[model samples]
Target: KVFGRCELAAAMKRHGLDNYRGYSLGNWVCAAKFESNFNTQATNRNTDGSTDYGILQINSRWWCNDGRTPGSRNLCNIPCSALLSSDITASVNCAKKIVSDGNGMNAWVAWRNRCKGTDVQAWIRGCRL
Candidate 1:
């Protein structure tokens, strides 16, 4: 499902991801926009033969399992399908681990290329949060 910008901001705030792991809400919001446009069911097949899952687009290579694929590192100990829910709890918990692992938001290439070092405030501009 697609979320409006403000709705997404509110949800992020409720999940405590607005300032998760010392990263700004703007960065998360911005990264999500470029990564999956706030759609929980979004999935992308990477050029490396791995699939990216959900709003944050966590990778199958090391994060979650895409049942059809074998030997996933499964660092998050989660099924890839878990990331495709509107609930977002599992996604947020796993994302925290990813960020806390010292990757910061840079774990996401989208953040590195677009959201990083840029004015990301626009991402939450109209939100009441």
Candidate 2:
């Protein structure tokens, strides 16, 4: 895993995830909690058989190729496994590109359901980062 809760907040802060493109770090943390539980090695299958990868759960249908998937946009131009690393550089970069592409944090269903309009400060409170 890249980090635990507090460490992840710190790392994400260093990565400029806070208020990135106007989205708060709390939004990202909430997404991570629902997507991967902050576990970078996390992988899951959709009902359609496409896969989601890494902390942000970047989808193989567009962002990365899993090799098992026949065709992918590979918008990030990286292998899906690359997002599974503990380093998190690739994950953060891809997420940035995603937000820039007009999806914003709304790209994540988790954010829509769990994070939207929530008090972002609660996600980071007592992390002491």
Candidate 3:
């Protein structure tokens, strides 16, 4: 599923990313914007043998078990395949764990480089929520 900005923002809000771990809705939206462009089925395989999956692009190396990430710990305790579903609850929950595990948004390189400490209002500007 390819979600529009407002649509993605609203969905994320419902899942509690709005202020999860002190990060605002805009922050989450902005990260998603650069991470996967709101594509639920997105995947990015790394040369190091790990892969990123879903809208948040949770990585295989330490997050989920893809059965192919080489030394995956399945830290999130779910298959990487779950992250590819358009029904994003599992992916969202996985992302929440990623943040709460002392990493915050810093877990995502895209978020650090693009959305960190930045005013990301444009990421959710037109959203009514």
Model 3: lDDT of residue 67? 89
Give stretches of model 2 more than 4 Å off. none
Winner by TM-score: 3
Rank the candidate models, highest lDDT first: 3, 2, 1
Query: How well does each candidate superpose onto the true structure, as a TM-score?
Result: 0.94, 0.94, 0.95
Q: Please give the range of 10 consecutive residues that has the lowest summed lDDT in model 1.
A: 64-73
> After superposing candidate 3, which stretches have Cα over 4 Å from the reference?
none
All candidates' lDDT scores? Answer: 0.88, 0.89, 0.89
Tell me how far the alpha carbon of residue 119 in candidate 3 is from the true structure, in angstroms, after superposition.
Answer: 1.2
Model 3, 2-116: lDDT tens per residue?
Answer: 9999998988998888888888899888888899998999999898989999999999999899888766788889999999888889988999989999878998899999888
Query: Model 3 — which ten-residue stretch has the worst lDDT?
Result: 66-75
Q: Write the per-residue lDDT of candidate 1 for residues 1-129, one digit (tens) a residue.
A: 787788888888899997777787888889889999889999999876789999999999999988756666899999999999988888889999999998788899999999999999889997898
